[PDB]
From a paper:
Glu166 is also hydrogen-bonded with the N-terminal Ser1 of the dimer partner to stabilize the [name] homodimer and intramolecularly with His172 to stabilize its active site.
The two structures exhibit no significant difference, except for the replacement of the Ser144 side chain, which caused little structural perturbation. The E166V mutation abolishes a hydrogen bond from Glu166 to the pyrrolidone moiety of bofutrelvir, as expected for the replacement of Glu by non-polar Val, but the positioning of the pyrrolidine ring is minimally affected. The Glu/Val166 main chain forms bidentate hydrogen bonds with the indole-carboxamide group of bofutrelvir in both conformations. The carbon–nitrogen distance would be too short at 3.0 Å in the indole-up conformation, whereas it is 3.6 Å in the indole-down conformation for a more favorable van der Waals interaction.
Author numbering:
A (entry chain A), B (entry chain A): 1 to 301
The structure:
């Protein structure tokens, strides 16, 4: 009954959020075991934002130049090290609330939950998708950096995103938990175009499937199409080209709903070529593509 | 930077979710101090769903007929009591993770976060609004009952909703934490019309304000209107009539944005009378009314 954007319970990740101060810069860090991960641009003072030599800047910082607080507790930093665009502060105490976790680099088009924090304390949680251009359409203010994106499976938390900066278009760029930026972005104060924002076609089809599951069926047609046929009438609308894997990924949904995959593409083709006509699908007046096929199966169990 | 539906961190509420079994019925309960709150329709067997005499049904249940589990821990039920449509099982142990909390009955149009659970374990979290007709547009399946809605302020958790049933239209009805249903709904298996779904006009205006804050300004006009004038050209579209309080509530936003409240109404009037014209506002193709003015100020700090 019903369907909306649902983030994972943020409890397993709150117990890992801490405050990190390095000069005038304050932001958030992730405390797992006896290490604290944070964006390396903490060490950057104001006049080091255009082109900062992080090696040179880090050579001037010592362990005591990094103050970490897990609430009122102050963790002693006993060893720092820069890994890609991320810093690894080794604290003397291990987080007793460290959950079963693993660092993973999500693929473009996969969803994850974000826990926007400020000054170490969590502020809110919301679902995000790794756009095809490698940006995320998040909600971040100053001090938001260090906030992580994650997926929760069973008892294992898969961290996949740490916020770093915003782009000139309002969307955001970040890094995986190993320090490598998603996309071609770099942690320098310079204008960085994000690239054309494509639409995750597989997710859209996945979203139409929960529609039919929930009783929204006005978009279903007596039509069908071919895979190549659909991609030609979908590239005009900047849609990710549908592959055979995408078809297979939608297999479980197609098999459950009794609606063939290519029949959905035919229903999607008519939506791109004719619009919504003021109708609505799962409460939305546009085509949603931040619901991955796997997100649908779990919410529509 | 950016703006989307953001729920409160669900950590303070996960430590209070437990499993409740009474016969073939299994659902979720809220464990605060030495009491567990759950919907009274646990005691209802299948053939007691049309018109159940809860007094009669509860007279046949004993303390041992209620099994409560907080994960692998089994809490002993030492005293049960029905309060309105909610049961209060007194367990022998107090929840060590009980947060500072209070039970509150939210007003129609206020938002709250929901933590949909199943078999006692949390599944996800999402933002909801108490619709004017007293329903909520949630996402619930079988076994979802007992899931709570809450707002988090500082360290205090204000529980305001416990899910009970779905309506014939896909929307959901529930109770406050004192057992009283929101709206005229009752916990019986019978068709219950929800009433016309009005639009929280104050929230819509609030949502347009974050728009202008975030750089979406195409909807702003050289026009203005009068309070009575706007309400007449808004009742046709089933919009909550704007009051002077609503105006005052939007004062902080209006004063910050340099846009008078009635000027926003004029911009809203043209949107209702002319549509979106394919444009978009904060990523939405329709007018959003589940962002309360207070939700905007905290997300746009
Ligand atoms: C983290 O704390 C913030 C998050 C930002 C604030 C507004 N919304 C966000 O997503 N990150 C920043 O402010 C970075 C900090 C820089 C420090 C030096 C190294 C590079 C990152 N800056 C930006 O996000 C930034 C700079 C900039 C310049 C020109 C266009 C866009 C732009 N974004
Ligand atoms: C809680 O576990 C579920 C939540 C439902 C399941 C589907 N989505 C939901 O929101 N609650 C129910 O299934 C209730 C249980 C009844 C037990 C006996 C007392 C009344 C509640 N039933 C309904 O939600 C229900 C019955 C019904 C009959 C006719 C139209 C709608 C309708 N909804």
């Amino acid at each position: 009954s019903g369907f909306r954007k649902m983030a994972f319970p943020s409890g397993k990740v709150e117990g890992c959020m801490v405050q990190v101060i390095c000069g005038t810069t304050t932001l958030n860090g992730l405390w797992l075991d006896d290490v604290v991960y944070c964006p390396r641009h903490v060490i950057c003072t104001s006049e080091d934002m255009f082109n900062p030599n992080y090696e040179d800047l880090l050579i001037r910082k010592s362990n005591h130049n990094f103050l970490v607080q897990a609430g009122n507790v102050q963790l002693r930093v006993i060893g720092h090290s820069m890994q890609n665009c991320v810093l690894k502060l080794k604290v003397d105490t291990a987080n007793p609330k460290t959950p079963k976790y693993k660092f993973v680099r999500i693929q473009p088009g996969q969803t994850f939950s974000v826990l926007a924090c400020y000054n170490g304390s969590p502020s809110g949680v919301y679902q995000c998708a790794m756009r095809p251009n490698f940006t995320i359409k998040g909600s971040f203010l100053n001090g938001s950096c260090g906030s992580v994106g994650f997926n929760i499976d069973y008892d294992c938390v898969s961290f996949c995103y740490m916020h770093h900066m915003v782009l000139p278009t309002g969307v955001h760029a970040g890094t995986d938990l190993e320090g490598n930026f998603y996309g071609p972005f770099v942690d320098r104060q310079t204008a960085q175009a994000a690239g054309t924002d494509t639409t995750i076609t597989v997710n859209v089809l996945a979203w139409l499937y929960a529609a039919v599951i929930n009783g929204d069926r006005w978009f279903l047609n007596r039509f069908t199409t071919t895979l190549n046929d659909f991609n030609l009438v979908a590239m005009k609308y900047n849609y990710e080209p549908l592959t055979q894997d995408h078809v297979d990924i939608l297999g479980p949904l197609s098999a459950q709903t009794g609606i063939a995959v290519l029949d959905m593409c035919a229903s999607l083709k008519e939506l791109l070529q004719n619009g919504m006509n003021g109708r609505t699908i799962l409460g939305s007046a546009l085509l949603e593509d931040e619901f991955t096929p796997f997100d649908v199966v779990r919410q529509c169990s």
